[PDB]
Every structure is written in C-alpha cells, then in structure tokens.
Amino acid sequence: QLTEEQIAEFKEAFSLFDKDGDGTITTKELGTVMRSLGQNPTEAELQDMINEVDADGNGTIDFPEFLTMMARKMKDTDSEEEIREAFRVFDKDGNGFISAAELRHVMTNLGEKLTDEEVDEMIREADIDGDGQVNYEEFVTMMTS
Amino acid sequence: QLTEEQIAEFKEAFSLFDKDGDGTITTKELGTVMRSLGQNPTEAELQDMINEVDADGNGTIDFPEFLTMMARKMKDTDSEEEIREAFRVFDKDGNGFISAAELRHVMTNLGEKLTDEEVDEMIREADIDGDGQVNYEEFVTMMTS
Amino acid sequence: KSDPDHLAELVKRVNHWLICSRWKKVQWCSLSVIKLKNKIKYRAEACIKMQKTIRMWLCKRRHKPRIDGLVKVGTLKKRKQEMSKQVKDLEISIDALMAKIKSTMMTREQIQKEYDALVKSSAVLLSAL
Numbered sequence: 001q002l003t004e005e006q007i008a009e010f011k012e013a014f015s016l017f018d019k020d021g022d023g024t025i026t027t028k029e030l031g032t033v034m035r036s037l038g039q040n041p042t043e044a045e046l047q048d049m050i051n052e053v054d055a056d057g058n059g060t061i062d063f064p065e066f067l068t069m070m071a072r073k074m075k076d077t078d079s080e081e082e083i084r085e086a087f088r089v090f091d092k093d094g095n096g097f098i099s100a101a102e103l104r105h106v107m108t109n110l111g112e113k114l115t116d117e118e119v120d121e122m123i124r125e126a127d128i129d130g131d132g133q134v135n136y137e138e139f140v141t142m143m144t145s
Numbered sequence: 146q147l148t149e150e151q152i153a154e155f156k157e158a159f160s161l162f163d164k165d166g167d168g169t170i171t172t173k174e175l176g177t178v179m180r181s182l183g184q185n186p187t188e189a190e191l192q193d194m195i196n197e198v199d200a201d202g203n204g205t206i207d208f209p210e211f212l213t214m215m216a217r218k219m220k221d222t223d224s225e226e227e228i229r230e231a232f233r234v235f236d237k238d239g240n241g242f243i244s245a246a247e248l249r250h251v252m253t254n255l256g257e258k259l260t261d262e263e264v265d266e267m268i269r270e271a272d273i274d275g276d277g278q279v280n281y282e283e284f285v286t287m288m289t290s
Numbered sequence: 291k292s293d294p295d296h297l298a299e300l301v302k303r304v305n306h307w308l309i310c311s312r313w314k315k316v317q318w319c320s321l322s323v324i325k326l327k328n329k330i331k332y333r334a335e336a337c338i339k340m341q342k343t344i345r346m347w348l349c350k351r352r353h354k355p356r357i358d359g360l361v362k363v364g365t366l367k368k369r370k371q372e373m374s375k376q377v378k379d380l381e382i383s384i385d386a387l388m389a390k391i392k393s394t395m396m397t398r399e400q401i402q403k404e405y406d407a408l409v410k411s412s413a414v415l416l417s418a419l
C-alpha cells in the first residue's frame with residue numbers, strides 16, 4: 001500500500017510522462033519515456049496496459065489510472081529487486097556506482113536541461129561517503145528523502 | 146518411475162495416434178497426446194521437448210521418449226488455483242467475470258497468440274448463456290476436470 | 291524570518307531541497323518504467339497460462355472420446371473348422387472398428403452404435419459356441 005508521500009513522489013515522476021501538463025497520457029508518452037530509459041515495449045503491449053485502466057475508453061488515462069496500471073500481486077523479494085533495477089538504469093555499466101557521466105546520460109534521455117555544473121551539484125548532494133560517485137545505499141537514501 | 150496403471154493409460158492414448166503399431170508417432174503428435182492426457186505445456190515448452198529428441202531431424206517420437214517427457218512435465222505442473230489466478234489478472238473489477246471480447250483481445254494479441262477460430266470455440270463453451278460475459282472460475286474448473 | 295542573513299540560509303536550504311527533488315523526480319520515474327516493464331511481463335505470463343490451458347482443453351475434448359471408444363472396443367476384443375471361422379470373423383470385425391477410430395474422427399455416438407453392433411453379433415457367437 002502506497003503512503004501519501006509515495007504517491008507524491010509518483011505524481012512528480014508522472015510529470016515526465018505528462019509533459020504538456022494536461023494531466024493525462026496516451027500510449028505514445030508511455031512508450032517514449034520507457035524507451036528512453038532502456039525498455040522495448042511493443043505497441044500491442046502498450047495498448048493492453050491502457051485497456052486495463054482506460055475506463056472511459058478514451059485511449060487517454062490520468063494519474064490514478066497510471067498508478068493502478070503499475071500495480072500487481074508482487075512476490076517477497078520483488079520490491080527490493082525493483083529498486084535495484086531502478087538503480088541499474090543509472091548505473092548502466094554495472095560497476096555499483098553512478099558517476100556524473102552516467103547521471104547526465106539519463107537526464108538527457110529524459111530531456112532534462114542542465115549544465116555540467118548542476119550535474120555535479122547533484123552528485124555532490126547525494127554523495128554522502130564523498131568519493132565522487134553514488135553507490136546504491138546513497139541513491140536509496142536520496143530516493144527516500 | 147511411473148505407476149504401472151499410469152504407463153498403461155498413456156499407452157492407451159499413445160496408441161490412438163500410432164496407427165502402424167511400431168510404437169512410434171510424429172513429433173507434431175507429441176502435443177496432441179500430452180494434451181489428451183490432461184497436460185498443458187506452452188508452445189515454447191513443446192518446441193523444447195522436440196528440439197532435444199529430434200536432433201536427427203526424423204520427426205519421430207517413440208513410447209519410451211514420450212514417457213520420459215510425460216514424467217518431466219508432470220513434475221512441474223500448474224494447479225487449478227494457479228490457472229484461475231492467471232484468469233483473475235484480466236478481471237478489471239474483481240467480479241469473477243470477464244467479457245468475451247476482453248478475453249478475445251488479450252489472447253489473440255498477447256502471449257502465444259490464439260487464432261480467432263480457437264477463441265470462437267472457447268466462447269461457445271465459456272459464455273453458454275450468450276450474455277458475452279464469462280465466469281472464469283467455472284470455465285477453469287471445467288477445463289481442468 | 292526577515293533578516294538578510296536568515297534569508298541567505300533560506301536560499302541555501304531551498305536550493306538543496308530543489309536538488310533533492312530533481313533526483314526524486316527522475317529516480318521515481320525510473321522506478322515507474324521498471325514497474326511498467328514488469329506489468330507487461332506479468333500480464334503476458336498470465337495470458338500464456340490461459341492460452342496453454344485452452345489449447346489443452348480444446349484438444350482433449352476432441353480426442354478423449356475417441357480414446358475412450360478405442361478402449362471400449364479394445365476390451366471387447368480381449369474378452370474346429372466351423373466355430374473358428376465364425377469367431378475369427380469377429381476379431382477381424384473388431385480390429386476393423388478399431389482401425390476406423392484410429393483413422394477417422396467420429397462422434398462418441400457413432401462409435402457407440404458400431405460398438406453396440408459388435409457386442410450383439412458377438413454375444414450371439416459366444417452363446418452358440
């Protein structure tokens with residue numbers, strides 16, 4: 001069960017999908033963001049996902065629907081494993097650390113516009129143990145913040 | 146490694162398809178025999194069974210080999226619960242009912258796709274009352290009886 | 291807080307907070323893509339479980355009757371010049387009905403009529419003898 005805080009972290013994530021701010025999305029934005037983060041969903045897979053929660057059959061969906069869409073009966077070790085895969089979307093080269101180059105790679109795919117100095121602002125703020133990188137513990141702490 | 150009574154029932158079934166009596170059938174018939182005996186592998190699982198027993202490209206399966214397969218498959222088998230649970234996944238509202246059309250779309254477009262005509266045959270059985278709504282708990286007890 | 295010093299601290303805290311928010315925006319988005327990725331695979335696996343169970347059921351219900359029929363005729367079978375010729379005339383008639391089923395799909399009812407015919411003529415040949 002999601003706490004209000006988690007929904008709110010999620011609502012923010014939604015804004016990367018719902019770029020234009022109208023509060024609704026289509027399979028088009030589903031596939032764009034997903035692909036820019038490494039995934040390879042097919043149109044059929046996207047259309048099905050929508051159908052489950054597209055109550056009014058508009059082909060369009062909104063934030064509560066978007067959240068139910070991400071739900072399913074999960075296993076024991078599944079939550080923890082997803083956090084780990086979320087990490088490995090950044091730690092693309094799998095060394096156990098996110099570096100600045102790696103952070104920017106993701107920020108660019110998602111289309112975030114920032115200067116190299118800001119990216120380092122970002123590494124610095126998460127880099128508790130102070131080694132110029134971001135390990136899994138620290139990334140998690142930041143996500144939790 | 147199989148009950149005398151068991152091995153006997155299989156031969157009963159294996160012999161419907163081996164017209165000549167050489168204790169041999171065709172690789173395509175493998176699935177038809179397993180399925181008649183109440184087994185339910187996936188197309189990929191079938192193709193695996195064939196790719197390890199058909200190295201010589203002869204396309205024959207003899208009783209011995211067929212037993213070996215019927216014993217592997219039997220050690221990794223889905224309970225009626227599990228199959229019902231799989232259906233439940235596509236129950237938007239938890240009613241215990243899914244619309245025929247919803248079933249047709251999932252199954253002719255995802256997974257190892259069914260033909261429209263195969264689905265036609267299931268709807269004929271699964272929505273006997275023609276309201277275009279299937280009670281899957283009942284349809285699954287039936288299939289697996 | 292209206293002081294020029296307090297207000298500079300404020301700008302520092304707010305700038306930090308913003309940075310901690312750009313992180314959570316992209317991190318939680320990363321977790322969404324993951325979760326979505328798994329919903330697709332979760333839904334496919336459940337689809338395939340329905341599909342295979344249907345393929346099996348569709349198949350069994352076509353052939354089980356024909357196996358059962360086969361067995362029925364096959365049991366019957368298991369159960370000097372004049373008597374033998376009249377009975378060998380039945381075995382051959384049985385193995386024929388047994389080859390019929392093994393070679394052409396037919397209804398349980400059709401099989402049943404043939405079987406009944408085999409039983410009657412056969413009971414008369416095992417009653418005389």
Ligand SMILES: [Ca+2]
Nearest residue numbers: 020022024025
């Ligand atoms: Ca939008």
Ligand SMILES: [Ca+2]
Nearest residue numbers: 054055060061
């Ligand atoms: Ca909608």
Ligand SMILES: [Ca+2]
Nearest residue numbers: 091093095097
């Ligand atoms: Ca790395």
Ligand SMILES: [Ca+2]
Nearest residue numbers: 131133134135
């Ligand atoms: Ca670090």
Ligand SMILES: [Mg+2]
Nearest residue numbers: 165167169170
């Ligand atoms: Mg043969």
Ligand SMILES: [Mg+2]
Nearest residue numbers: 203205206207
């Ligand atoms: Mg062979």
Ligand SMILES: [Mg+2]
Nearest residue numbers: 237238242243
């Ligand atoms: Mg429903």
Ligand SMILES: [Mg+2]
Nearest residue numbers: 272273274278
């Ligand atoms: Mg019905």
